[PDB]
Write a protein that binds this ligand. Structure first.
Ligand SMILES: COC(=O)c1ccnc(N)c1
Ligand SMILES: COC(=O)c1ccnc(N)c1
Lengths: 216, 215
């Protein structure tokens, strides 16, 4: 069993984790996902979680005090603290495999212009911390990234179940005048394997030449 | 100004995103996000959306006849059809900027084994189609990728979500000392040219450490 805790100021945005495979993994008892409202750990009546950045700049930074209290309660020395951020190390398939064997993930979701760096620095004195980016784009908050990470990891957990995959087809064999590639209907496993390997390598050079060690 | 239609067998997955739209943007008619259950376009009593792959192999492939009907109803010639797939072209910040001025996005959410390729190929003969990946990992379905794409795009449309090279370096706020860690004194110095130079060096170091590909 894995435990995943997600900490966020928008707990309602994490509801989709109840759908499809994360939902089915939860129902199978393979994982427990708990979502926590960061404002639970505030003490002012304003429940303030942010303030202006030292040194200037646009926007607001999440305060370390509130985060520290939340993580103190939720984390242990065995926790893997995951902090989604566009400035993170890349989260990849390899990362997903690695984290799939973890006992406890805590995902700290930032909003505004990010979380005071001392939160991660303080946590790293007690536990393993991983600041990660899920791709080359910016979001308003870490919540959607948390959903991506949870899905990519949970589908790899024992008991739940390079190159680009080429096109796939199913019935009927002809549709709107478009035919399924005849080799796929031929029953020749060697020819199908070869055609699929070729399609995979062809799609990869077109869409992801970087995966084969080429420019762009 | 932008309409987004999402087609999925898990429509509830997209509902917090709809709720997260500020009323002011909806009232101003800046944005409309509609979610459609793909099973609306199934043909049989069992509401079948997938079938075994031609050529053999594991998993299931989503049916072209079902998807074809769904897109026929939902798309027009002006539609940008977005198909999240781990086998796609990379979705990047540049892509998000490009798509932020579109009138109509339709996002087709499929299982990772894929939608029958004839669906995208047929659609591409009468509209613009973009098969895209949001990163180097596999999900079970495209729904979480759809959420990422919707958020990355809509936050670039003025007034829609409520928000106003090298990696950004660390940020700090009050208090100036916390658990034995002080905010870097340069940030309190009132020397704003020096602060900018310090931030540039922090950005350089962080980029070398975390994303050497960017240099
Ligand atoms: C606020 O979080 C983000 O913007 C984010 C998080 C993780 N990966 C990204 N590419 C963006
Ligand atoms: C099923 O969809 C995916 O697995 C997917 C979609 C978009 N980008 C990815 N990296 C994966």
């Amino acid at each position: 069993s894995m435990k995943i805790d997600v900490v966020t100021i928008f707990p309602e945005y994490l509801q989709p984790v109840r759908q499809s495979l994360p939902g089915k993994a939860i129902d199978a008892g393979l994982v427990d996902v708990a979502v926590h409202d960061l404002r639970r750990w505030t003490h002012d009546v304003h429940k303030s979680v942010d303030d202006s950045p030292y040194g200037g700049g646009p926007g607001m930074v999440m305060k370390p005090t509130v985060w520290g209290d939340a993580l103190d309660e939720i984390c242990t020395s065995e926790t893997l603290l995951v902090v989604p951020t566009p400035a993170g190390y890349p989260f990849t398939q390899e990362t997903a495999w690695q984290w799939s064997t973890e006992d406890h993930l805590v995902i700290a979701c930032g909003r505004y212009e990010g979380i005071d760096q001392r939160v991660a620095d303080d946590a790293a004195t007690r536990m393993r911390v991983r600041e990660v980016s899920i791709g080359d784009y910016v979001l308003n908050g870490g919540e959607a990234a948390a959903l991506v990470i949870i899905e990519a990891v949970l589908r790899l957990v024992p008991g739940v179940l390079s190159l680009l995959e080429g096109p796939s087809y199913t019935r009927p064999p002809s549709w709107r005048g478009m035919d399924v590639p005849p080799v796929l209907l031929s029953g020749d496993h060697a020819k199908i394997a070869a055609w699929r390997a070729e399609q995979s390598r062809q799609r990869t050079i077109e869409r992801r030449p970087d995966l084969l060690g080429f420019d762009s």
